């Protein structure tokens, strides 16, 4: 942590989840699910990766519900904000994980497991390959910018407290959060990365790329689901079909 972090960002950071704990819990659920299945009821790699993404989304919702500002909204408003941004938060989570824990050529998973990009290149279809090609480049850009945890938590709030959401009772609090977080991120980047005179603007430019990736991920999930490749009802699927 740098010597200089804005008070608002300090408060956002307090709300962060305990990474080592999230990783363990997820790795356990996953194992038990695959055990005690006959040959023709055993889960595919896709089914396991789906349950993994589902449990990560549970963790994201658990983060949001106890978070500063978000916790001040009524449940109905909370539902609307999360339905608007769920896939973007999953994508942002994945991308930041690659920046912190990942290395060139390999994808680091929430369980601490890893798979090489080259495996996907060979084996996967066109939708997942395009998806992964764009995510890999976004990670590469963020590594170049020296994207850090302070900036990461600011982006999470900017994605969550979106101005594009209609029918909120307390739309005012949402505007307030967006204004305050934008201002703190700009102060933070100018202070701590002064050689990068454009870092704030460059970080904001990544948000439309995050949105584009999460939409193609939704499309990918949708087709897999309607092909029968999704094991049971889960939060992922609920969010996919909502609104």
């Amino acid at each position: 942590s740098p010597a200089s972090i804005p008070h608002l960002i300090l408060e956002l950071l307090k709300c962060e989840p305990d990474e080592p704990q999230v990783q363990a819990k997820i790795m356990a659920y996953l194992q038990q699910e695959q055990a005690n299945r006959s040959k023709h009821e055993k889960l595919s790699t896709f089914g396991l990766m789906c349950k993994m993404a589902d449990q990560t989304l549970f963790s994201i919702v658990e983060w949001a519900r106890s978070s500063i500002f978000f916790r001040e909204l009524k449940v109905d408003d909370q539902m609307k904000l999360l339905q608007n941004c769920w896939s973007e938060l999953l994508i942002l989570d994945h991308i930041y994980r690659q920046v912190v824990h990942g290395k060139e050529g390999s994808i680091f998973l929430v369980t601490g497991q890893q798979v090489d990009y080259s495996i996907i290149a060979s084996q996967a279809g066109a939708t997942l390959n395009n998806l992964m090609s764009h995510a890999q480049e976004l990670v590469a850009k963020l590594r170049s910018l020296q994207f850090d945890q302070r900036e990461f938590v600011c982006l999470k709030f900017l994605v969550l407290f979106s101005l594009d959401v209609k029918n909120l009772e307390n739309f005012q609090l949402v505007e307030g959060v967006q204004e305050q977080v934008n201002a703190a991120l700009l102060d933070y980047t100018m202070c701590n990365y002064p050689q990068q005179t454009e870092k704030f603007g460059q970080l904001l430019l990544r948000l439309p790329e995050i949105r584009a990736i999460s939409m193609q991920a939704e499309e990918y999930l949708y087709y897999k689901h309607l092909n029968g490749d999704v094991p049971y009802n889960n939060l992922l699927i609920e969010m996919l079909h909502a609104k």
Partner: peptide, 15 residues
Amino acid sequence: PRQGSILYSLLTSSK
């Protein structure tokens, strides 16, 4: 009404 809502369940548990 979608009583089956997992998201609603998670949110109502914190309010």
